[PDB]
Write a protein that binds this DNA or RNA. Structure first.
Ligand SMILES: [Mg+2]
Lengths: 105, 673
DNA sequence: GGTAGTGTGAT
DNA sequence: ATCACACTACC
């Protein structure tokens, strides 16, 4: 139930959307990314009512990440009305995310 | 004979103060030191050795000490002083001839570390003196609590400098004798530290005389410089930099930027087994952070790993990025480097084929970009860039090592004026035109000088003819100057288009390979060996020659060297390139004795060498010279004289193939091509 | 601020 | 083949 993004659908899917949207900037080669990946499926399913989870593979979509100064992956960006509300880097845990979410939502 | 050496406040170009000198006189076995105020006496001592028909030994004296003393004598004592060429011996010139299979630091200009192979001990010591001296200085100042500055070790005379000075004559004297103990160049019968100058050149191998005359003339050439159109190259740089930008824009669009891991310190281990995973990019585990009670704005959570990354923008200069983007377009590398990596030279880039048309088209942009950068690099941005080398007198004084190559060829550097782009390559006209006599205005009449470019005609083939004359009685030689050797070789080998044969021959002489050989007609790469068999089959003399050369070296060697036209030994790296070494060495020594004889003949005709004279040597690029002349008439004389001298050289070495030259008059290197 | 690797510039 | 030197990528 996760939104799979692209550079061209970003502005409209994330910035011009209602509600909080958590974006995961990841890559196939990154280790921590492949780690927090399963966690996201659950999170996307649990908060299925008050949050949308979206992934952006930075190799297929090389234009967006730079606009946010991505310096490490996976990078989690929380958007609220087209702006970055909260941001955390690194493969957080199923519970660390829950905290970050509940605390920022 | 006397061995000498001096210490001054700078390089020839800007020296103004004679700090000190030392002389060892063989006739008295003593070392006399000369401090600042003994300069007049130092000079008297050298002229004294000249009056008695003696000899003066210096290490790198031909390029520094002698011209330096002339200059310093005129500036500090308002005295004219000119050591005659015939009275001077240079142990640096001697080592380069005797230990030709070795390199050297060009008196400290090159880092020992970067040089391959061993180095003659005494020579290394002599070339490292400025560096060691600077070390003792810098080390001693700091013990006195003072800041060290640029090159203050050379501003004033001191006793540490005088000690180093004496040391030099000590080592130079040892090096000199080590060199004289080589019976191949100096007969054991004679004591060369006890003969007059005319005997020293006379009784030693011909090569000693040639190299000393070559170093002397070439020292003059560096001083002359090559008139350079600075403004011209700056305007060209603006153009090139523009085309570079535009090529970067179009390219940084077709090929987007990407992300790459970078900055990773810890190893990534499977979160389940712990199995280290070195194949995976290195990560980093933040030691602090947490989600938090005030929220924690920071972006890291302790224990939560992440792969630190950087944003890399396509750089057309990086063959790696190019290899990364093209395979990603469907390019399947064929030939890799002998060290794990795809080949991305202009040849392969030329053969790459991809689906996306825009990509296929970008490949040409990349090739143009690489070439543009090559030009910018050589003319403006590189370390040895022309614009960084032009001097106040408006000339580029390129360095030349009269015998820096094994074969006896010279090497040129700072900047290598023997590698200016040719008129046939992209932007070669403009580059080449920026180097010309026209860019020098006469010191008296303000009028532009004229240039004379003379090229030894088909020297490599003539040298080949000569050496095969022993087996074909001058057949090849005769065909060269009467028939169409190129056609004859066209019939020897099959190669359709008796012009592919010309490509074939010069290839056959300068190494080349079966692939490139067959690549003349068509594909037939290694299959082209068949062609390199028909030739040698229809030209048995070249085969006889090779066999004979082998008998000379191989038996495990019977001898590891070949005898050049002037008797010197010419180290042979591999038996496979022996014929090549022989030929290149011949052409080399022929062109050396040639530019030497040319200038002597010009001087015996009345003409003076210098910008304050009639002609000025500007450059010597293996088989060619470019000479600045004050007038067309003089330019006509130089050309005629370059032809006479070449014939004289041919006669001098009983060459079995008539030798020639062709010259062109013009304003610069572009027209004189 | 050097080293190694890969390449191009010329005869 | 013989040689100089530039630009990338790495410590
Ligand atoms: Mg000296």
């Amino acid at each position: 139930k996760i939104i799979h993004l692209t550079d061209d659908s970003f502005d409209t899917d994330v910035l011009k959307a209602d509600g909080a949207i958590l974006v995961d900037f990841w890559a196939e080669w990154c280790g921590p990314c492949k780690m927090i990946a399963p966690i996201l499926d659950e999170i996307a399913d649990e908060y299925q009512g008050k949050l949308t989870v979206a992934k952006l593979n930075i190799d297929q979509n090389p234009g967006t990440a730079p606009k946010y100064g991505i310096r490490g992956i996976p990078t989690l960006l929380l958007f609220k009305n087209g702006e970055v509300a909260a941001t955390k880097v690194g493969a957080l845990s199923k519970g660390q995310l829950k905290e970050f979410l509940d605390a920022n939502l | 004979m006397i061995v000498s050496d001096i210490e001054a406040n700078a390089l020839l170009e800007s020296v103004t103060k004679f700090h000190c000198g030392v002389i060892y006189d063989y006739s008295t076995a003593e070392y006399v030191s000369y401090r600042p105020s003994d300069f007049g006496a130092y000079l008297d001592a050298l002229e004294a050795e000249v009056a008695r028909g003696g000899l003066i030994v210096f290490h790198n004296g031909h390029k520094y000490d002698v011209p330096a003393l002339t200059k310093l004598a005129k500036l500090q004592l308002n005295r004219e002083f000119h050591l005659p060429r015939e009275n001077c011996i240079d142990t640096l010139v001697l080592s380069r001839l005797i230990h030709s299979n070795l390199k050297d630091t060009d008196m400290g200009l090159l880092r020992s570390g970067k040089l391959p192979g061993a180095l003659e001990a005494w020579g290394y010591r002599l070339g490292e003196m400025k560096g060691e001296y600077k070390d003792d200085f810098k080390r001693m100042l700091e013990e006195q609590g003072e800041e060290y500055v640029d090159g203050m070790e050379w501003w004033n005379f001191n006793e540490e400098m005088m000690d180093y000075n004496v040391q030099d004559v000590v080592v130079t004297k040892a090096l000199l004798e080590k060199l004289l103990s080589d019976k191949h160049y100096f007969p054991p019968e004679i004591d060369f530290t006890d003969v007059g100058y005319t005997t020293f050149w006379s009784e030693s191998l011909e090569a000693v005389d040639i190299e000393h005359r070559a170093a002397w003339l070439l020292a003059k050439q560096e001083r002359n410089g090559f008139p350079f159109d600075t403004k011209a190259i700056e305007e060209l740089y603006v153009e090139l930099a523009a085309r570079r930008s535009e090529l970067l824009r179009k390219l940084t669009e077709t090929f987007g930027s990407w992300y790459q891991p970078k900055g990773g310190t810890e190893m990534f281990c499977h979160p389940r087994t712990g199995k280290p995973l070195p194949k995976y990019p290195r990560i980093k585990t933040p030691k602090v952070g947490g989600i938090f009670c005030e929220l924690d704005t920071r972006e890291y959570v302790a224990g939560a790993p992440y792969t630190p990354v950087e944003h890399v923008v396509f750089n057309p200069s990086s063959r790696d990025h190019i290899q990364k983007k093209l395979q990603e377009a469907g390019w399947v590398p064929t030939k890799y480097t002998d060290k794990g990596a795809p080949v991305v030279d202009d040849e392969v880039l030329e053969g790459v084929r991809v689906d996306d048309p825009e990509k296929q088209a970008a490949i040409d942009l990349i090739k143009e970009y690489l070439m543009i950068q090559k030009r910018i690099g050589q003319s403006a941005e590189g370390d040895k860039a022309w614009l960084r080398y032009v001097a106040e007198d408006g000339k580029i004084h390129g360095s030349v090592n009269p015998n820096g190559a094994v074969t006896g060829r010279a090497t040129h550097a700072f900047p290598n004026l023997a590698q200016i782009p040719g008129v046939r390559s992209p932007y070669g006209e403009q580059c080449r035109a920026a180097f010309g006599a026209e860019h020098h205005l006469d010191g008296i009449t303000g009028k532009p000088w004229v240039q004379a470019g003379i090229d030894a005609s088909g020297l490599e083939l003539r040298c080949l003819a000569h050496f095969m004359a022993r087996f074909d009685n001058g057949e090849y030689a005769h065909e060269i100057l009467n028939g169409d050797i190129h056609t004859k070789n066209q019939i020897a080998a099959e190669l359709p288009t008796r012009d592919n044969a010309k490509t074939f021959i010069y290839g056959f002489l300068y190494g080349a390979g079966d692939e490139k050989i067959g690549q003349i007609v068509g594909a037939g790469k290694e299959r082209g060996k068949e062609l390199k068999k028909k030739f040698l089959e229809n030209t048995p003399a070249i085969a006889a020659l090779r066999e004979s050369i082998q008998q000379t070296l191989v038996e495990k060697w019977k001898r590891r060297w070949i005898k050049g036209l002037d008797g010197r030994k010419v180290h042979v790296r591999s038996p496979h390139a022996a014929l090549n070494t022989l030929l290149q060495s011949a052409g080399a020594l022929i062109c050396k004795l040639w530019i030497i004889k040319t200038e002597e003949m010009l001087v015996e005709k009345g003409l003076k060498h210098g910008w304050d004279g009639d002609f000025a040597y500007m450059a010597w690029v293996h088989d060619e010279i470019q000479v600045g002349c004050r007038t067309e008439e003089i330019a006509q004389v130089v050309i005629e004289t370059a032809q006479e001298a070449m014939r004289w050289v041919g006669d001098h070495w009983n060459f079995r193939c008539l030798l020639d030259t062709e010259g062109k008059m013009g304003p610069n290197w572009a027209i004189c091509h």
